[PDB]
Each structure stands twice: as structure tokens, then as C-alpha cells.
């Protein structure tokens, strides 16, 4: 509406655009690592609810699609283990969960696509290695789109700013001219 | 066909098997149940000069100490190190 208001929004959406881009780049590297680790994890995999996701949002419909234990801080806050997702999952993570004790996880397909004794620890591990590959791809995807949406909003807001900037000057001048005439 | 993997490495996609129980596989495995092992390694990577140091260190905590099932964990570590 007013130049000061747009000024603050513009600085805000400019920061977001940059952060979303950097977050896309971190997730791209995290996915690159995860997809490499998923290869030997699948061949190993071949041979109560409770719900598998992570602590971190900004990954689209990863948490919502999978949503009394739940691995991931998002699972319990929406509906217990914390500190998952940030560091790639290990078999030790699966053991911790199994020791504290269907299985609901996001299965990796591609960068865009994903779908919802000792072998007990194997199944938890399988779900973990698939989940993070899906989560890192989905975050990379969502942040790419967010950074694009931020870009288009920066342009739209900059145009509104400049039309308002010009209109303010023109209006002030017309009031001055009218008073003088 | 025969499949042999750890959670991180694939070795194969007669087999001598230790029963799992820490020991040698001839086509070193830690434990588990296609042969599934928590840690499967060479054989080139193992030392072995430091496993003797690990065995003696585990036999040092055994003469502790004391409280049951602690203890039972120490003995398992002694069994893995002896193999």
C-alpha cells in the first residue's frame, strides 16, 4: 500500500529468496549423498503404527502424508524421537528405535516423485534410508519453487513500489500547482 | 545365487558361515542372520595389532566391576575380539 510498508516487505522477500536458494543447494548436496547411500541400502533391504519422517519442515507433503512413538519431531507436534533428518540415518538409529520398543514411510521414486528380531531393525533402517532420500529431494524441490515464487513476488512488489513512487510525486505536484493557480 | 551385504557395502549380489557369531566368512563378519551382517569387512582393513589392545582392554573392564549385565556387555566384547 504505502512505500515504507513495501520497503520492508521487499527487504524481507529478498532475504527469503536468497535463503530458499541456499536451502535448495544444501538439500541438493544432501540428496546427492542420500541417493548414493540408497543403492546398497536397497539390496540390503530386500531380505503398533508408528510413523517415519523428520524434525525439519519446508519439504512439502512429507510430514502431512505420513501423519504411540513416531520418529521425527514433526510427527508428535502434528499428532517419540528427536534429532532426525539433519544427519543421514544409520543402522544405529534403527537400533535405538527398536531397543526402545505396518511401517509408514515415504518411498523414493525420483527427484519429483515419492509415495507412502534383527529383521525388525532391518525394516526400520529400510524405511529410514528411503525416507531421507525422499525428504531431501522434496525439500530441494519445494525450495527451488519457493525461490522462484519469491523472485516473481520481488518483481511484482518492485513494480508496485515504483508505480506508487511515481504516483506520490505526481500527486504532490498537482496539489502544489492547484494551490498556485 | 548368493547375496552378501552389510548395511553399507555389498560384497556379492559353498559359503562357510560362523554361527550369527563374530568370525571369518569364506566364499570377517560381526553378527546378524542371503548373508546379512551388521559389520562385514576385509581382511585387508582389519588391525589386528590394535585388536590385541582391544582384547586386553575388554579383559580389564571384566575384572571390575561387578554389576550384572554390564559386564555381560563386556563379555560379548571379549568374544568379538577373540575371534
Amino acid at each position: 500500500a504505502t512505500l515504507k510498508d513495501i520497503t520492508r516487505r521487499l527487504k524481507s522477500i529478498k532475504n527469503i529468496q536468497k535463503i530458499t536458494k541456499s536451502m535448495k543447494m544444501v538439500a541438493a548436496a544432501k540428496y546427492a549423498r542420500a541417493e548414493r547411500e540408497l543403492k546398497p541400502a536397497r539390496v540390503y533391504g530386500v531380505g503398533l503404527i508408528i510413523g517415519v519422517s523428520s524434525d525439519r519442515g519446508l519439504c512439502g507433503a512429507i510430514h502431512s502424508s505420513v501423519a504411540i512413538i513416531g520418529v521425527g519431531d514433526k510427527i508428535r507436534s502434528i499428532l517419540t524421537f528427536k534429532e532426525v533428518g539433519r544427519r543421514p540415518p544409520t543402522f544405529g538409529d534403527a537400533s535405538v528405535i527398536a531397543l526402545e520398543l505396518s511401517i509408514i514411510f515415504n518411498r523414493f521414486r525420483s527427484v519429483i516423485s515419492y509415495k507412502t528380531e534383527y529383521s525388525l531393525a532391518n525394516i526400520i533402517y529400510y524405511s529410514l534410508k528411503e525416507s531421507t532420500t525422499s525428504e531431501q529431494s522434496a525439500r530441494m524441490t519445494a525450495m527451488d519453487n519457493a525461490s522462484k515464487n519469491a523472485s516473481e513476488m520481488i518483481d511484482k512488489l518492485t513494480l508496485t513500489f515504483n508505480r506508487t513512487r511515481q504516483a506520490v510525486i505526481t500527486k504532490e505536484l498537482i496539489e502544489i500547482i492547484s494551490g498556485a493557480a | 545365487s548368493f547375496t552378501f551385504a552389510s548395511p553399507t557395502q555389498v560384497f556379492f549380489n559353498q559359503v562357510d558361515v560362523p554361527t550369527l557369531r563374530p568370525g571369518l566368512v569364506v566364499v570377517f563378519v560381526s553378527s546378524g542372520s542371503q548373508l546379512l551382517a551388521e559389520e562385514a569387512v576385509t581382511l585387508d582393513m582389519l588391525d589386528l595389532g590394535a585388536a590385541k589392545a582391544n582384547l586386553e582392554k575388554a579383559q580389564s573392564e571384566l575384572l571390575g566391576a561387578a554389576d550384572e549385565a554390564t559386564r555381560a556387555e563386556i563379555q560379548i566384547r571379549i568374544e568379538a575380539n577373540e575371534a
Binding site: 544405529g92 537400533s95 | 582389519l46 549385565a69
Partner: peptide
């Protein structure tokens, strides 16, 4: 019955200890 399975313990803890002893060597 195995000694580790008396006061405790699971085979998951067995394998966890054995796997770590391989890494540390």
C-alpha cells in the same frame, strides 16, 4: 540359554557390540 540373555539382554545389543568391535579394529 546364552549368558548375555540372563540379566538382560537382547541380540540387538549383542550385534551392536560385535559390530563396533570390528570397526574399532
Amino acid at each position: 540359554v546364552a549368558y548375555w540373555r540372563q540379566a538382560g539382554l537382547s541380540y540387538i545389543r549383542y550385534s551392536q557390540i560385535c559390530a563396533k568391535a570390528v570397526r574399532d579394529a
